[PDB]
Amino acid sequence: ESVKEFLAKAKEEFLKKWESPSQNTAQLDHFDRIKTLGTGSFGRVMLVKHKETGNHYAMKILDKQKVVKLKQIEHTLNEKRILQAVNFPFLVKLEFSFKDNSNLYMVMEYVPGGEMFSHLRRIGRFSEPHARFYAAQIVLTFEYLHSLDLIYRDLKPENLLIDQQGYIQVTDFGFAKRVKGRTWTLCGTPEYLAPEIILSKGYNKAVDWWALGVLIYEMAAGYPPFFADQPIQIYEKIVSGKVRFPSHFSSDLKDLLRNLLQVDLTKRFGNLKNGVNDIKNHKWFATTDWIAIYQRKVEAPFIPKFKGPGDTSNFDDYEEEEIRVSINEKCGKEFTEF
Ligand SMILES: Nc1cccc(-c2cnco2)c1
Numbered sequence: 372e373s374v375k376e377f378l379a380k381a382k383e384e385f386l387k388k389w390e391s392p393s394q395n396t397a398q399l400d401h402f403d404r405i406k407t408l409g410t411g412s413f414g415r416v417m418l419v420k421h422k423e424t425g426n427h428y429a430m431k432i433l434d435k436q437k438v439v440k441l442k443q444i445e446h447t448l449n450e451k452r453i454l455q456a457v458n459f460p461f462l463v464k465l466e467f468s469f470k471d472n473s474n475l476y477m478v479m480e481y482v483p484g485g486e487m488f489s490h491l492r493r494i495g496r497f498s499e500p501h502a503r504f505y506a507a508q509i510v511l512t513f514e515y516l517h518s519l520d521l522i523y524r525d526l527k528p529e530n531l532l533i534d535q536q537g538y539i540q541v542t543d544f545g546f547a548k549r550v551k552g553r554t555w556t557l558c559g560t561p562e563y564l565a566p567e568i569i570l571s572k573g574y575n576k577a578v579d580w581w582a583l584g585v586l587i588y589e590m591a592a593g594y595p596p597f598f599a600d601q602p603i604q605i606y607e608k609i610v611s612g613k614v615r616f617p618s619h620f621s622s623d624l625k626d627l628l629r630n631l632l633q634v635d636l637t638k639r640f641g642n643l644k645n646g647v648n649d650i651k652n653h654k655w656f657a658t659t660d661w662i663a664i665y666q667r668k669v670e671a672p673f674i675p676k677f678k679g680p681g682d683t684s685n686f687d688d689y690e691e692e693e694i695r696v697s698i699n700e701k702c703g704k705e706f707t708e709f
C-alpha cells in the first residue's frame with residue numbers, strides 16, 4: 372500500500388503540472404556563458420552562471436530551425452513538457468525554460484561529476500555491486516516514469532550523470548514521450564534499441580526494460596552486448612535472440628540479463644503481470660534495500676572528483692561557438708506551446 376499511495380500522489384502532482392505547464396521563466400541575459408559541456412546536430416549544453424544569484428546551471432540550447440529540419444519538433448515539446456512536470460530523486464531538475472527568436476532553452480541543475488560514460492570507460496568496468504547500485508536507481512526511476520504513462524527511450528551511459536553524493540541523475544529527455552497506448556517512432560541509440568523498435572512495431576515501456584538490460588551488461592562488462600561497424604549489423608545481433616556473457620558475470624547476473632534482453636516483449640521482465648516486481652525480487656537484487664536507495668541513504672561506490680560547483684573538469688573540451696539570436700522570429704507557430 373506504501374508504493375500504491377506514493378505512486379498515486381506522484382501522478383496527481385505530475386498531472387497538475389502536465390495540464391498547466393510553466394513557460395517563460397527566465398531569459399538569456401540573466402546568465403553568463405562559461406563553457407560548452409556537450410554538442411549535437413541541433414543543440415548544445417552550456418555551463419552558465421546566473422548573474423544575480425551566482426548559481427551554476429546546465430543550459431540546453433536547441434536551434435529551432437535545425438529542430439524542424441531534423442524532424443524533432445514534437446520531441447522537443449515532449450522533452451520540456453515532461454521535464455517541467457516530473458519530480459524524482461534520480462532525474463536532473465529543470466529550473467527554468469524560455470525561448471527567443473532562434474532557440475529553445477532548458478536550464479537544468481548543473482551536476483559537476485560528469486557522465487557515467489566517462490567514468491565507465493576510465494575505470495574499465497564496474498563491479499557487480501557498483502553496477503547494481505546504479506541499476507537500482509534506474510529501476511525506481513522507470514517505475515516512476517512508467518506509472519505516469521511515460522517512456523524514456525534514451526537510456527545509455529552518456530545520459531546518466533553522477534552527482535556529488537555518487538547517485539545518478541538522468542539527463543536528456545529528448546526522446547521521452549507520454550504514450551497513449553503504444554508508439555512508433557524510430558529513435559534511440561542503435562546499441563540500446565529493443566527488437567520491436569528495429570522491426571517497426573508499435574511499442575510500449577518494455578523498450579526501457581530492454582535498454583536496462585543493455586545498460587547493466589555494459590556497466591558490468593565495460594562494453595555493450597551488441598556492437599558492430601554498421602547499424603544493420605548491430606540490429607541483426609539484437610533481433611537474433613543470442614547474447615554471450617563474460618565468464619566473470621555471476622549466474623544471477625546472467626539470469627537477470629536473459630530476462631531483460633528477452634526478444635519476445637510479451638515475456639520480458641518489467642512487462643509481465645507482476646511488473647517491476649519481477650526485477651526488484653530477482654536474486655541479483657537480493658542485497659538491495661529499495662527504500663534506502665530511494666532515500667539516498669546507501670553509501671555510494673564512487674564519489675566523482677571535482678573542485679566545486681563550477682568545476683568542468685569531468686566534461687571534455689569542445690569548440691566554443693556563438694549563441695546567436697536572430698533579429699526575426701523563426702518557427703514561432705511550431706513552438707507556440709514551449
Ligand atoms: N545532456 C547533458 C550533456 C552535458 C552536460 C549535461 C549536464 C550537466 N549538468 C547537468 O546536465 C547534460
Ligand SMILES: Nc1cccc(-c2cnco2)c1
Binds near residue numbers: 520549550551552
Ligand atoms: N495529454 C496527453 C498527451 C499525450 C499523452 C497522454 C496520455 C497517455 N496516457 C494517458 O494520457 C495525454
Ligand SMILES: Nc1cccc(-c2cnco2)c1
Binds near residue numbers: 549550551
Ligand atoms: N501522442 C498522442 C497522439 C495522439 C493522441 C494522443 C492522445 C492523448 N489522449 C488522447 O489522445 C496522444
